């Protein structure tokens, strides 16, 4: 019962983007690269994490739109990220733990706004911790240094190179 | 090495809940089971939970209709586990 997983990284090692902005955050944003602890099975057609809709609402919150490519059909998903304590940081809206997770962290490292962005994400099930980071563009394209940048970040939590990603982009699902 | 499950099956998919069924393994090694699930395509499972070794039966709850999720069910010993046994579902 003792979890088998990488564990996950100390908060002083998940830096916040110094003087995040809400409201530039705001928008559409394309997955690019993709890491993190959970052992994924080896899939010869596996399902895609397209890009992430975060509207910033009136009370301060994120309404996130996860869109998904499976078996070659675009997919959404609806979350709510309320802020944590300080700014860049989230939870995930209030949901049922068991079996649920207990708790929730989302942690925006790097970001300028219109270009590129890297959040942190964990979940926690009582023992058992789950995280991930994500690389972001406004495009599917971005620079070698930012994408080499997050190597370099998600290595520095603990993760192989193997569980370190960049999928490749669907023609499909935003347009 | 711990042995997996090998007849989990679905049942009773409805739009937002999915029945998992199998049949208890039977080795005093066996401590319980652990479910986790992940929609396809996402880094971090959305639900896990566990049931004792005496269960061959649990219903995965508030889930949302036409998403494929990736259900896998784990034997668990006293410091091991198996490969996941994984099989993916959509709801309806």
Redesign the interface.
Known sequence: ??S?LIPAPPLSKVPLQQNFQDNQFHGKWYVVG???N??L?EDKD????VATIYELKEDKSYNVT?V????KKC?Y?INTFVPGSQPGEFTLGA??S????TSTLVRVVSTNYNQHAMVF?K?V?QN?E???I?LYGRTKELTSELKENFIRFSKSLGLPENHIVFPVPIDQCID | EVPQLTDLSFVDITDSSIGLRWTPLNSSTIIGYRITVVAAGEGIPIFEDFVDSSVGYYTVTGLEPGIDYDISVITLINGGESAPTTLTQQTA
């Open positions: 019962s003792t088998d993709r890491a993190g959970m052992r099975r596996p399902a895609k994490m996860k998904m490519f499976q078996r997919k998903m949901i049922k068991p079996p649920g997770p994400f979940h099930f058992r789950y995280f991930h994500t």
